[PDB]
PDB file of C-alpha atoms in Angstrom:
ATOM      1  CA  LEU A   7     -16.839  14.238  21.242  1.00 35.87           C
ATOM      2  CA  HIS A   8     -17.555  13.722  17.580  1.00 31.55           C
ATOM      3  CA  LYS A   9     -19.010  15.864  14.918  1.00 33.65           C
ATOM      4  CA  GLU A  10     -21.916  14.303  13.003  1.00 35.03           C
ATOM      5  CA  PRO A  11     -23.497  15.460   9.830  1.00 30.87           C
ATOM      6  CA  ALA A  12     -26.823  17.281   9.658  1.00 28.35           C
ATOM      7  CA  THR A  13     -28.943  19.161   7.030  1.00 27.65           C
ATOM      8  CA  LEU A  14     -30.654  22.542   7.686  1.00 22.23           C
ATOM      9  CA  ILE A  15     -34.429  22.377   7.708  1.00 21.01           C
ATOM     10  CA  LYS A  16     -34.947  25.894   9.011  1.00 23.80           C
ATOM     11  CA  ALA A  17     -33.613  28.657  11.215  1.00 21.18           C
ATOM     12  CA  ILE A  18     -35.748  29.380  14.273  1.00 22.19           C
ATOM     13  CA  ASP A  19     -33.972  31.824  16.548  1.00 18.25           C
ATOM     14  CA  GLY A  20     -30.545  32.946  17.785  1.00 17.96           C
ATOM     15  CA  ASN A  21     -29.982  29.707  19.725  1.00 19.23           C
ATOM     16  CA  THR A  22     -32.528  27.306  18.191  1.00 17.70           C
ATOM     17  CA  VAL A  23     -32.390  25.620  14.730  1.00 17.22           C
ATOM     18  CA  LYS A  24     -34.349  22.873  13.024  1.00 15.86           C
ATOM     19  CA  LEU A  25     -32.153  20.177  11.455  1.00 13.96           C
ATOM     20  CA  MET A  26     -32.593  16.880   9.670  1.00 15.40           C
ATOM     21  CA  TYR A  27     -30.470  14.611  11.847  1.00 14.64           C
ATOM     22  CA  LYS A  28     -30.168  10.923  10.873  1.00 12.90           C
ATOM     23  CA  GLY A  29     -33.306  11.133   8.697  1.00 11.63           C
ATOM     24  CA  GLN A  30     -35.536  12.818  11.238  1.00 10.60           C
ATOM     25  CA  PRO A  31     -36.417  16.497  11.767  1.00 12.77           C
ATOM     26  CA  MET A  32     -35.207  17.671  15.193  1.00 11.33           C
ATOM     27  CA  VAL A  33     -35.059  21.035  16.916  1.00 12.44           C
ATOM     28  CA  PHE A  34     -31.576  21.701  18.389  1.00  9.05           C
ATOM     29  CA  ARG A  35     -30.973  24.124  21.185  1.00  7.81           C
ATOM     30  CA  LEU A  36     -27.353  25.475  21.076  1.00  8.91           C
ATOM     31  CA  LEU A  37     -25.589  24.425  24.238  1.00 10.21           C
ATOM     32  CA  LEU A  38     -24.272  27.009  26.701  1.00  7.66           C
ATOM     33  CA  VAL A  39     -25.737  30.036  24.881  1.00  3.08           C
ATOM     34  CA  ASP A  40     -28.208  32.520  26.462  1.00  3.57           C
ATOM     35  CA  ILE A  41     -29.996  35.157  24.528  1.00  2.14           C
ATOM     36  CA  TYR A  54     -30.386  41.835  20.608  1.00  2.00           C
ATOM     37  CA  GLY A  55     -32.810  38.959  20.286  1.00  2.00           C
ATOM     38  CA  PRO A  56     -33.632  39.830  16.703  1.00  2.00           C
ATOM     39  CA  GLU A  57     -29.974  40.412  15.718  1.00  2.00           C
ATOM     40  CA  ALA A  58     -29.065  37.015  17.317  1.00  2.00           C
ATOM     41  CA  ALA A  59     -31.794  35.352  15.233  1.00  2.00           C
ATOM     42  CA  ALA A  60     -30.566  37.165  12.127  1.00  3.60           C
ATOM     43  CA  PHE A  61     -26.983  36.108  12.667  1.00  4.75           C
ATOM     44  CA  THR A  62     -27.771  32.427  13.345  1.00  3.61           C
ATOM     45  CA  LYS A  63     -30.173  32.270  10.369  1.00  4.28           C
ATOM     46  CA  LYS A  64     -27.444  33.644   8.043  1.00  3.04           C
ATOM     47  CA  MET A  65     -24.887  31.325   9.541  1.00  6.85           C
ATOM     48  CA  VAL A  66     -26.790  28.086   8.885  1.00  2.00           C
ATOM     49  CA  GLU A  67     -28.506  29.188   5.624  1.00  2.00           C
ATOM     50  CA  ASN A  68     -25.182  30.183   4.032  1.00  2.00           C
ATOM     51  CA  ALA A  69     -23.272  27.156   5.256  1.00  2.00           C
ATOM     52  CA  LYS A  70     -22.316  24.427   2.874  1.00  2.00           C
ATOM     53  CA  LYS A  71     -22.055  21.997   5.692  1.00  2.00           C
ATOM     54  CA  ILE A  72     -23.693  21.699   9.144  1.00  2.00           C
ATOM     55  CA  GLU A  73     -22.575  19.354  11.932  1.00  2.00           C
ATOM     56  CA  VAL A  74     -23.983  18.551  15.306  1.00  2.00           C
ATOM     57  CA  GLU A  75     -21.749  17.666  18.211  1.00  2.00           C
ATOM     58  CA  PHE A  76     -23.383  16.293  21.376  1.00  2.00           C
ATOM     59  CA  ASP A  77     -21.632  16.906  24.614  1.00  2.46           C
ATOM     60  CA  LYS A  78     -20.942  14.201  27.213  1.00  2.50           C
ATOM     61  CA  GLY A  79     -24.196  14.346  29.198  1.00  4.11           C
ATOM     62  CA  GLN A  80     -27.889  14.345  28.371  1.00  5.93           C
ATOM     63  CA  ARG A  81     -28.612  14.823  24.596  1.00  4.72           C
ATOM     64  CA  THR A  82     -32.133  16.210  24.805  1.00  6.10           C
ATOM     65  CA  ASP A  83     -33.946  18.565  27.128  1.00  7.08           C
ATOM     66  CA  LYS A  84     -37.329  18.035  28.790  1.00  9.48           C
ATOM     67  CA  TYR A  85     -38.840  19.653  25.725  1.00 11.10           C
ATOM     68  CA  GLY A  86     -37.362  17.095  23.384  1.00 10.23           C
ATOM     69  CA  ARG A  87     -34.794  19.535  21.867  1.00 11.52           C
ATOM     70  CA  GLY A  88     -31.383  18.245  20.942  1.00  9.49           C
ATOM     71  CA  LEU A  89     -28.648  19.826  23.057  1.00  7.93           C
ATOM     72  CA  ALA A  90     -25.536  20.308  20.955  1.00  6.87           C
ATOM     73  CA  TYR A  91     -22.725  22.455  19.560  1.00  4.48           C
ATOM     74  CA  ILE A  92     -23.769  23.230  15.977  1.00  4.77           C
ATOM     75  CA  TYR A  93     -20.984  23.814  13.430  1.00  4.50           C
ATOM     76  CA  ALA A  94     -21.325  25.601  10.112  1.00  4.57           C
ATOM     77  CA  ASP A  95     -18.459  25.107   7.722  1.00  3.02           C
ATOM     78  CA  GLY A  96     -16.301  23.890  10.567  1.00  2.00           C
ATOM     79  CA  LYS A  97     -17.021  26.959  12.665  1.00  2.00           C
ATOM     80  CA  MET A  98     -18.868  26.485  15.955  1.00  2.00           C
ATOM     81  CA  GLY A  99     -22.096  28.500  15.890  1.00  2.00           C
ATOM     82  CA  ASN A 100     -22.340  28.652  19.700  1.00  2.00           C
ATOM     83  CA  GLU A 101     -18.955  30.350  19.962  1.00  2.00           C
ATOM     84  CA  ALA A 102     -19.502  32.736  16.978  1.00  2.00           C
ATOM     85  CA  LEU A 103     -22.660  34.089  18.733  1.00  2.00           C
ATOM     86  CA  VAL A 104     -20.922  34.750  21.969  1.00  2.00           C
ATOM     87  CA  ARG A 105     -17.849  36.170  20.134  1.00  2.00           C
ATOM     88  CA  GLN A 106     -20.147  38.626  18.317  1.00  2.00           C
ATOM     89  CA  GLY A 107     -21.565  39.697  21.744  1.00  2.00           C
ATOM     90  CA  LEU A 108     -24.983  38.444  20.615  1.00  2.00           C
ATOM     91  CA  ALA A 109     -25.364  35.947  23.432  1.00  2.00           C
ATOM     92  CA  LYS A 110     -24.029  35.253  26.951  1.00  2.00           C
ATOM     93  CA  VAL A 111     -22.544  32.010  28.172  1.00  2.00           C
ATOM     94  CA  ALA A 112     -25.453  30.271  29.990  1.00  2.00           C
ATOM     95  CA  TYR A 113     -25.323  28.113  33.144  1.00  2.00           C
ATOM     96  CA  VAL A 114     -23.963  24.581  32.610  1.00  2.00           C
ATOM     97  CA  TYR A 115     -26.930  22.179  32.811  1.00  2.00           C
ATOM     98  CA  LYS A 116     -26.563  18.483  33.440  1.00  2.00           C
ATOM     99  CA  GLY A 117     -22.739  18.307  33.116  1.00  2.00           C
ATOM    100  CA  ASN A 118     -22.670  19.452  29.396  1.00  2.00           C
ATOM    101  CA  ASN A 119     -19.762  21.885  29.798  1.00  2.00           C
ATOM    102  CA  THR A 120     -16.955  20.652  27.573  1.00  2.00           C
ATOM    103  CA  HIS A 121     -16.676  23.894  25.605  1.00  2.00           C
ATOM    104  CA  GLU A 122     -17.624  26.126  28.558  1.00  2.00           C
ATOM    105  CA  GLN A 123     -14.165  27.731  29.048  1.00  2.00           C
ATOM    106  CA  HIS A 124     -13.708  28.279  25.340  1.00  2.00           C
ATOM    107  CA  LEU A 125     -16.971  30.185  25.229  1.00  2.00           C
ATOM    108  CA  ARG A 126     -16.144  32.126  28.378  1.00  2.00           C
ATOM    109  CA  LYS A 127     -12.938  33.232  26.588  1.00  2.00           C
ATOM    110  CA  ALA A 128     -14.987  34.341  23.527  1.00  2.00           C
ATOM    111  CA  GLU A 129     -17.392  36.150  25.865  1.00  2.00           C
ATOM    112  CA  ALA A 130     -14.695  38.132  27.769  1.00  2.00           C
ATOM    113  CA  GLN A 131     -13.285  39.333  24.397  1.00  2.00           C
ATOM    114  CA  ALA A 132     -16.730  40.494  23.216  1.00  2.00           C
ATOM    115  CA  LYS A 133     -17.033  42.138  26.572  1.00  2.00           C
ATOM    116  CA  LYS A 134     -13.582  43.862  26.244  1.00  2.00           C
ATOM    117  CA  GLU A 135     -14.610  45.057  22.720  1.00  2.00           C
ATOM    118  CA  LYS A 136     -17.916  46.229  24.339  1.00  2.00           C
ATOM    119  CA  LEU A 137     -19.638  44.542  21.403  1.00  2.00           C
ATOM    120  CA  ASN A 138     -23.441  44.383  21.019  1.00  2.00           C
ATOM    121  CA  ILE A 139     -25.038  43.225  24.364  1.00  2.00           C
ATOM    122  CA  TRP A 140     -21.749  44.516  25.964  1.00  2.00           C
ATOM    123  CA  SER A 141     -22.288  47.944  24.384  1.00  2.00           C
TER     124      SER A 141
END
């Protein structure tokens, strides 16, 4: 997998962001993250708005959903947004869809720790 550059257009919700990706606006849905809805939106908005650099990383399977959203791991300043959400207990690891599961175990590990800390949705 490779990290590619992107520019924030606008925050949307805890697991959805609008980016300029190779010169076109695209909505990206954060892979593997299920949505504390308003706190998830708040946290993702702060994450991408305060970042000096945003990167998209497609997984190994399909790159867009039926709705035309990009399906990716979004990084802000090197830090994976999908993991930071789960780590904060602001989202659950979702079901793998279409074989895009490369970071699944990593996120399950972040999720069990949020769960052990009884953080947020694990309260």
